[PDB]
C-alpha cells in the first residue's frame, strides 16, 4: 500500500534531482577550435578553465522559430517546473487524501511534463547541428524513471478505483 507510494515519491524525487543535474552542467560535449562541455546555458573548455555564456541565438520563419525555441531552453525549464508542480501535487495528495480524483490529474500532468521534457530533448538534439555529455544521459534516465513512476502511479490509481468500486457496491 504505502510502500509503492513511497517508491513513487522517491522515484519522483530522484527524477527531479537528475533533471536539476541536467539543468546544471555537463549536458553535452563539443570539440571547439580541444573538447568543451556545455549545459545549455554556458560553455566551458577543457584558456583551459574559462567559462562564458555561449548560448548566442543570433550568429524561412520556421528556422527562426526553431532558433527561438532552442534559445534559453524554454521547453525543459517549463518541463522541470511542471515536474515540480506534479511532485508538489503528489506530496499534497499523499497526506490527507480527501478527494480521490486529484491523483489522476497529477499523474496526467506528470506524463505531459515527461512528454514535454522528451520534446525539449528532441529540440536540444536537433539544435546541435564530437561526443555527448553525461547529464544528457542523466536526463534520459530521469525520463525513464518518470515513465515508470507514472505507470506505478496510474496502477495505484486504478487499484484505488477498483477498491472504491468494490466498497461502493
Amino acid at each position: 500500500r504505502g510502500v509503492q507510494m513511497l517508491l513513487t515519491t522517491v522515484g519522483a524525487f530522484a527524477a527531479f534531482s537528475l533533471m536539476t543535474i541536467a539543468v546544471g552542467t555537463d549536458y553535452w560535449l563539443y570539440s571547439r577550435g580541444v573538447m568543451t562541455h556545455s549545459g545549455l546555458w554556458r560553455t566551458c573548455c577543457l584558456f583551459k578553465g574559462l567559462c562564458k555564456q555561449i548560448d548566442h541565438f543570433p550568429e524561412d520563419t520556421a528556422e527562426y522559430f526553431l532558433r527561438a525555441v532552442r534559445a534559453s531552453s524554454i521547453f525543459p525549464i517549463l518541463s522541470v517546473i511542471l515536474l515540480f508542480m506534479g511532485g508538489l501535487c503528489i506530496a499534497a495528495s499523499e497526506f490527507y487524501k480527501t478527494r480521490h480524483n486529484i491523483i489522476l490529474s497529477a499523474g496526467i500532468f506528470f506524463v505531459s511534463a515527461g512528454l514535454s521534457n522528451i520534446i525539449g530533448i528532441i529540440v536540444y538534439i536537433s539544435a546541435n547541428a564530437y561526443s555527448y555529455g553525461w547529464s544528457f544521459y542523466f536526463g534520459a534516465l530521469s525520463f525513464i524513471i518518470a515513465e515508470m513512476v507514472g505507470v506505478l502511479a496510474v496502477h495505484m490509481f486504478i487499484d484505488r478505483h477498483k477498491q472504491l468500486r468494490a466498497t461502493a457496491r
Binding site: 506524463v111 515527461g114 522528451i118 538534439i125 515513465e147 505507470v151 496510474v154
Partner: peptide, 19 residues
C-alpha cells in the same frame, strides 16, 4: 548512432500514453 535512442524513447513514451 543517436536517432535510434530518441526512437526508443518515443516508443516507450507512446507505450506510456497507451497504458
Amino acid at each position: 548512432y543517436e536517432i535510434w535512442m530518441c526512437i526508443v524513447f518515443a516508443y516507450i513514451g507512446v507505450s506510456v500514453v497507451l497504458f
